[PDB]
RNA sequence: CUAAGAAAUUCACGGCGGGCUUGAUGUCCGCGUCUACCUGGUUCACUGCCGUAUAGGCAG
């Protein structure tokens, strides 16, 4: 109810990639721009999120402090995207901000990794380890994912993140490693 | 509400003996394929990590 400094990031189109690859590379610029930058009370907000469309966002809405956003505008590590996307300026926030939920949460929709560690620890067989794990223990989470196709697996992958409910009261807290919610809400407008 | 309505084909068996198909040959001449392109499908709604219970620092 006190962090009223926003830092928006408008996404323009480019012919060499869609918005999903720009959201993945900008996701790397956030994991290395915040995790390799510093500042716990700096979060991000995705305003084009839709759980029925599998989208991530059509315009970034950053939320930081006064100097937490006043010193990130002149970032030479924020270059490159100045030619690919567009920027803005600082603007005030309204009084009643709705308490929304946006953060990262990893789900375990695969029993093959726990079947590998369970084959190295439990000593399961083919039919005993294959039958000790039922088919209903795995599930695909249809949230807004990001194809973070980095140098761990060569093919395209998905993204996992869990959001929170909507509310009106303010409950602030410390941001996560990617500028999300982990016990503290964020405004959504 | 039908050219309506109904129905046991059964049993058995030795095909078998013999043969010379041969002789001879020219497939020939000629030919313009060519211009243009973003694979990033997800070459698996994903691949290995504290709990065989959904909680994660992952190479993402």
Curated annotation (Swiss-Prot):
The gene is cas6f. This is CRISPR-associated endonuclease Cas6/Csy4. Its EC number is 3.1.-.-. Changing residue 150 to A: Cleaves pre-crRNA 8300-fold slower. The record marks 150 as: Substrate binding. Changing residue 153 to A: Cleaves pre-crRNA 380-fold slower. Changing residue 31 to K: Cleaves pre-crRNA 130-fold slower. Metal-ion independent. Disruption phenotype: Infection with phage DMS3 inhibits biofilm formation; disrupting this gene restores biofilm formation despite DMS3 infection. Normal biofilm formation in the absence of phage infection. Loss of production of crRNA in the presence or absence of phage. Disruption of the entire Y.pestis-subtype CRISPR region disrupts crRNA production but does not alter phage resistance (possibly OLNs PA14_33350 to PA14_33310, plus the flanking CRISPR loci), indicating this CRISPR is not involved in phage resistance. Changing residue 31 to D: Cleaves pre-crRNA 910-fold slower. Changing residue 31 to A: No pre-crRNA cleavage, still binds crRNA. Does not support formation of the Csy ribonucleoprotein complex. Part of the Csy ribonucleoprotein complex with a probable stoichiometry of Csy1(1),Csy2(1),Csy3(6),Cas6/Csy4(1)-crRNA(1). A Csy3(6),Cas6/Csy4(1)-crRNA(1) subcomplex is also formed.
């Amino acid at each position: 109810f006190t962090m009223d400094h926003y830092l928006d990031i408008r996404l323009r189109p480019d012919p060499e990639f869609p918005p999903a690859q720009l959201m993945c590379v900008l996701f790397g610029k956030l994991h290395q721009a915040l995790v390799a930058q510093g500042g716990d009370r700096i979060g991000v907000s995705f305003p084009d999120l839709d759980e029925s469309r599998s989208r991530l966002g059509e315009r970034l809405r950053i939320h930081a402090s006064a100097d937490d956003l006043r010193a990130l505008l002149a970032r030479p590590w924020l270059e490159g995207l100045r030619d690919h996307l567009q920027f803005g300026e600082p603007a005030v926030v309204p009084h009643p901000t709705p308490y929304r939920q946006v953060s990262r949460v990893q789900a375990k929709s695969n029993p093959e990794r726990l079947r590998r560690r369970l084959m190295r620890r439990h000593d399961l067989s083919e039919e005993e380890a294959r039958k000790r794990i039922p088919d209903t223990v795995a599930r695909a989470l249809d949230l807004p994912f990001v194809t973070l196709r980095s140098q761990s697996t060569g093919q395209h992958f998905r993204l996992f993140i869990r959001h929170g409910p909507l509310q009106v009261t303010a409950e602030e807290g410390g941001f996560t490693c990617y500028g999300l919610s982990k016990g503290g809400f964020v405004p959504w407008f």
